[model samples]
Target: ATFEIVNRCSYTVWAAASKGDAALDAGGRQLNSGESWTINVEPGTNGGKIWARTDCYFDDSGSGICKTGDCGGLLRCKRFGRPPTTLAEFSLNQYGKDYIDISNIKGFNVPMDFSPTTRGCRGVRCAADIVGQCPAKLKAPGGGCNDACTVFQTSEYCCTTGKCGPTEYSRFFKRLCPDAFSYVLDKPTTVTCPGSSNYRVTFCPT
Candidate 1:
């Protein structure tokens, strides 16, 4: 049978199918980022077909590793005999979606790029997702390392654990250029999630 692929979400997508590549089950696998594609079959080939949302996954660390709820999911082409040809209904929580531009994102003060970019003679970094660090870890040598304006390796910091964790560079930009309202990004692009096609489905405030 011939299978048809369709994109119905807000952003573009990259897709493929797989079966019995590494299985003893009744399902298949699909293709996702960092993965290529081919056709193969073996024992218990009852299942195998993978899918993913290719729009834009959140690289909160700016390391390009798309986090959970951002991408990755599967479509059982074997069991169902074809790809899902419909949309899904989802709900959001209290938090609302916010569009962060690359211009603004790059301007922020983050440790990854803020290294050596001294703030008041000392280096500054955004304590996001770093184990035993801010938010997760309690107060430490300096004021509770998670609190906003909590002084640490350098000058005062703007805590982003609870709300928005714009890197140190981002915070510095806001702090230094408080009056400037025009936020400019070097280049701009949009990311869309086309419903159930993703093996990794997670869009907070969406």
Candidate 2:
């Protein structure tokens, strides 16, 4: 029997490479949940290897030797080749609780948060004596003028005297003036569920 798995991340994941398309790329195509494809596992006969690749799930600085710093690592086979066993079943700990469980085999629903968010710091004067959140304070020379803090404590892409760019995987750039969108930059990633530039990044191949 063949096992079908869903592509939950923002991008597609490659199942076994030879079959099915990549997950991240599939995500870009905007697939629906519960949608899946098959993978044939012959067990130890055909090199005994099954890999899932994605732009997310970057596994480096650990046992997995990811020279390019990408998310294409070998998924450990757990008694693979059995009828019910395809891969490890993409398991994870449910929320903040203990005990890991296999993730949803079905597809995913799009989030409303997918749209651009308003710039937290940028705004116009509403009235006299009315002060709103201001941008980061301008610092010394060489560094650009300051703007208010945005993204809170998540990242430092606000109006500070630091790097002026998007956050990793941010769909849009943050607004420095009026309406703006979130910015993104390419940072080292971890492999969690729906993995991307977000958390759940894995340090090991497991």
Candidate 3:
């Protein structure tokens, strides 16, 4: 499988992909507006997530901080991004289909769209301006919306203990983006595309 990370925002964005050893192309190079970076995944490679880091500054050694969606202070992400990130989750070659989604369960920072290059595969996207419309209680300090699970940490919000259902908080995100995953058990988020040649993940797609 392969992924092409496209940047459509006016400013530059640092693309981060989380896989084994946190391998990043060219040590986390910047994708200027209307630019893109391509990543190739070997067969059987599965269960990885990709996101964009915004308002970032790094020295020659690839060390810096991102205003939103920073992954462990490294340009290359060793782990998944922290809360308040828009995630493109993927699981390839599973049950002979490719599973992908744009999830806001941990809250959203940027607008994203994921589409398969092959035919007959529907694209999925979450393009709502989440930061501007974030709820007062769930808003992050810098920007973006924080998940109710991260804000409240209670069984009701986190759904840590048992089967959980939607709450007013989750409903807020769902209303903005009915196609994206708003909570952990959000069912309508997944798009099971037939195994395709490649997929495109675009940030700030207009």
* lDDT by candidate, in order shown: 0.25, 0.23, 0.82
lDDT per residue (tens digit) for residues 12-131 in model 3: 988888753555343355899999898876645576788887888887877888887787778877777777888888877786788888888888888999999887678888898888
Model 1 agreement with the true structure over 97-168: per-residue lDDT tens digits: 111111122111111111111122221122232213333322233211222332232232332333333444
Q: What's the TM-score of every candidate structure?
A: 0.20, 0.20, 0.93
Question: Which 10-residue window of candidate 2 scores lowest in summed lDDT?
Answer: 107-116
Model 2 gets an lDDT of 0.23
Ranked candidates, highest lDDT first: 3, 1, 2
Pick the lDDT winner: 3
Candidate 1 wrong stretches, greater than 4 Å: 20-45, 55-206
Q: Name the lDDT value of residue 40 in candidate 3.
A: 79
- The candidate scoring highest on TM-score is 3
Over the stretch 139-164, how does candidate 2's per-residue lDDT look in tens digits?
Answer: 21221122213224333544244465
Model 1 residue 194 CA deviation (Å) reads 29
In candidate 3, which residue pairs clash? Answer: none
